[PDB]
């Protein structure tokens, strides 16, 4: 029985969620993290409603409004279902420990490579978010004219006249840190969980291809036991994917709806900017939206594809010389494996690179037709 923090794949994220007391501890950090950020997001939305006579200001503020709204939604859903995430990561740790003890060079190198990729991706995500957030918070200084990093509108308050401006700016920069802390680790957690799903799938594929090694054919009991174990492992992977699905399913549905709504307006605003520098900001926004969506879709797609290839892994085994019953069991394994283990977004659309490509095609067509009509 390992620990959530001891498993290399899920440690970092858990630790972060432990620091802000979302998943593993219930100190006072949770409330200081959540309440200020939610209040700030509400004031941003009020500023959105107020300042809408200029589409440029509307969109520039609305991007961050939606960003922090998604942050708030993710953190709330996380605290609500902390037990489910905790148990999922505990199962991840247990299965990781079980796999690590497999005596097979291919499986060991596979596990090591995927663990390294997961940890590197998480640490990257965090550092990239930190640097981008710092750049955005410092951006207003160069602009001048008393601009805030994000939107804010308290009724009956001149927020850009008195030292008010200063204190609002300071509180905004300070509240930046917990917000990114709640936002990025969900994406990092999805990446890590999908990577461990791939680790399990490929371990099972290798076991399927090399299950008859060190077993005598005369005794059918050992062969039957080995195929039973393979079936149970397949069921384990299916359950893992189902739970990961449910969670990321609902959260990603909300996220992708919001991202599409924002991307439409971003494409609209692309060709209306004459500032020569705001267009750079628009391009940056599009880049981050597309990169996040691509991360989600790429990892979900890899899960689907490896789950499908489990069928070929079953086919390539030593099934020609086994008794008829084991051949039938492998036939059933091939039958089941041909259905992809999808991670649906909202339980409506499976997440695949086909969906991401469709979104990209829609965005490209929209931009081309926009540029044509606006001519």
């Amino acid at each position: 029985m390992a620990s959530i923090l001891d498993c290399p794949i899920v440690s970092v994220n858990a630790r972060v969620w432990r620091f802000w007391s979302f998943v593993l501890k219930h100190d006072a950090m949770r409330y200081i993290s959540i309440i200020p950020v939610t209040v700030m997001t509400f004031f941003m939305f009020t500023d959105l409603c107020r300042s809408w006579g200029n589409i440029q200001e509307l969109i520039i503020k609305a991007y961050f409004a939606v960003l922090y709204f998604n942050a708030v939604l993710r953190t709330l859903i996380l605290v609500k279902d902390r037990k489910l995430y905790e148990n999922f990561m505990q199962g991840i740790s247990n299965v990781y420990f079980e796999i690590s003890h497999i005596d097979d060079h291919k499986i060991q190198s596979l596990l090591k490579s995927y663990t390294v990729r997961a940890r590197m991706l998480s640490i990257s995500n965090l550092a990239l978010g930190a640097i981008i957030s710092t750049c955005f918070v410092v951006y207003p200084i160069f602009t001048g004219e008393r601009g805030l990093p994000y939107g804010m509108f308290i009724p009956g308050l001149d927020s850009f006249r008195s030292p008010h401006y200063e204190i609002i700016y300071i509180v905004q920069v300070v509240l930046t840190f917990p917000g990114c802390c709640m936002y990025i680790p969900f994406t990092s957690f999805f990446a890590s969980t999908t990577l461990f799903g791939l680790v399990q799938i490929k371990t099972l594929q290798r076991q399927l291809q090399t299950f008859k090694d060190n077993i005598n054919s005369q005794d059918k009991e050992k062969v039957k036991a080995k195929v039973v174990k393979l079936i149970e492992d397949h069921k384990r992977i299916i359950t893992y994917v189902s739970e990961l699905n449910s969670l990321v399913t609902y959260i990603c549905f909300v996220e992708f709806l919001s991202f599409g709504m924002m991307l439409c307006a971003l494409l609209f605003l692309l060709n209306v900017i004459e500032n020569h520098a705001q267009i750079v900001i628009v391009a940056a926004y599009i880049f981050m939206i597309i990169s996040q969506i691509f991360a989600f879709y790429w990892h979900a797609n890899e899960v689907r594809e490896e789950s499908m290839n489990l069928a070929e892994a079953a086919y390539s085994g030593p099934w020609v010389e086994l008794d008829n019953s084991i051949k039938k069991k492998l036939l059933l394994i091939i039958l089941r494996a041909q259905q992809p283990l999808e991670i649906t977004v909202g339980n409506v659309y499976p997440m695949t690179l086909e969906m991401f490509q469709s979104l990209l095609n829609a965005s490209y067509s929209y931009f081309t037709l926009l540029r044509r009509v606006y001519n």
């Binding site: 079936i231 299916i238 019953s325 036939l331 059933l332 039958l335 089941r336 409506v348 659309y349 009509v373």
Partner: protein
């Protein structure tokens, strides 16, 4: 109103009959003659008001905005008429469906799950009926209220149009007392009956789907212990017992398939006409929403129209998708049991079941589509894209 699938739906059948939805099949002959007359009268009244609306659209055709508004109202109220006329012509297949589950299978070991899931199906059917009834009541109340708060004036100078809930041409004065009161009561009755007719037929469709889904759940729940029964190196009596269990499972699955096919036959063409009318309604509504400028009365009306239309589509799609997912889950639940220990007969049974469950049960709109949340998503995307095209080109 005695045997299965009509005793279960009996409240729904009574609600359908009460609003004037024909259904001259499930009561004593004494009520046969009066009920029929009532139905006819209802239809008459509907058509009458319907015609009075169509006439109104003729002399309101000089402008395009009022033409679009009138067309949207006309299609919205066309839905009930199509449903009302559509049931009696196809009533034979409907009665064939409602009598499908009169004589179902039964096994001593799988009776408890059957009872539990039958009860759950009944409870969910009643819940759905009550929810949709409340939705229709809220819709009519909102219609009346919005009509009362708004200002009854039509653009020209200023001209006071009669303060009515539906624009319509009446021989009466329609401005003084008697005409105003009669028109108000008549329009209220028309709204109530039209919404009740349409939504009652839709709810009956969805309740059929609910019953099928609960039966699939029962099949999976008893799938789990069927193998345990088989697994044991068996004796003759145990061989007979497992054979009987496999027979029960297979025959109940086939019965569920029969019910699904009958439901597709009965309501297959109704969905096609429903979506045919919707498409036009949503196009006109997209154009209408393009004109919104923050006014509560206009924006409220447009939002209500869009919400009702997408709600009907969404109801159908929700329950079609549930059936699809339940059949796929039958595949999954067939896999996830101790079939590797059962006798060869049970293993072949599992193999054939898993082969069968490769494709998901579905309801199609006369083969031109299937009802699933994918269909609703595509409809929503199409309307949003058309709205974007309209606004950009403006």
């Amino acid at each position: 109103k005695h045997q299965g699938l009509v005793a279960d739906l009996l409240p729904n059948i009574r609600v359908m009959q009460g609003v004037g939805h024909f259904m001259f099949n499930y009561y004593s002959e004494g009520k046969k003659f009066p009920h029929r007359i009532y139905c006819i009268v209802t239809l008459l009244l509907l058509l009458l008001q319907y015609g009075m609306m169509a006439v109104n659209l003729m002399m309101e055709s000089d402008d395009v905005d009022d033409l679009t508004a009138n067309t949207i109202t006309m299609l919205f109220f066309l839905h009930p008429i199509v449903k009302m006329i559509y049931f009696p012509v196809r009533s034979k297949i409907f009665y064939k469906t409602l009598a499908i589950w009169n004589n179902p299978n039964s096994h001593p070991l799988f009776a408890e799950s059957n009872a539990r899931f039958h009860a759950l199906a009944i409870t969910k059917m009643r819940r759905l009926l009550f929810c949709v009834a409340g939705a229709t009541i809220f819709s009519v109340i909102s219609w009346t209220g919005i009509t009362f708060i708004e200002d009854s004036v039509k653009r020209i100078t200023i001209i006071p149009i009669p303060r009515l809930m539906i624009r319509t041409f009446y021989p009466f004065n329609a401005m003084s007392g008697a005409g105003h009161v009669f028109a108000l009561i008549y329009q209220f009755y028309y709204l109530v009956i039209s919404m009740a007719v349409s939504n009652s037929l839709d709810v009956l469709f969805c309740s059929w789907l609910l019953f099928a889904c609960e039966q699939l759940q029962h099949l999976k729940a008893i799938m789990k212990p069927l193998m345990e029964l088989s697994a044991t190196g068996l004796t003759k009596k145990q061989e007979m017992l497992v054979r009987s269990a496999i027979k029960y499972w297979v025959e109940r699955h086939k019965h569920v398939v029969r019910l699904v096919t009958a439901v597709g036959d009965a309501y297959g063409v109704a969905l096609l006409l429903h979506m045919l009318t919707t498409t036009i309604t949503l196009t006109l509504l997209a154009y209408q929403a393009t004109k919104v400028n923050g006014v509560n009365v206009y924006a409220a009306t447009v939002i209500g129209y869009l919400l009702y239309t997408l709600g009907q589509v969404f109801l159908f799609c929700i329950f079609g998708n549930r059936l699809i997912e339940e059949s796929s889950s039958v595949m999954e639940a067939a896999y996830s049991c101790h079939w590797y220990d059962g006798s060869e007969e049970a293993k072949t049974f599992v193999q054939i079941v898993c082969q069968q469950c490769q494709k998901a049960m579905s309801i199609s709109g006369a083969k031109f589509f299937t009802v699933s949340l994918d269909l609703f998503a595509s409809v929503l995307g199409a309307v949003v894209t058309y709205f974007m095209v309209l606004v950009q080109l403006k």
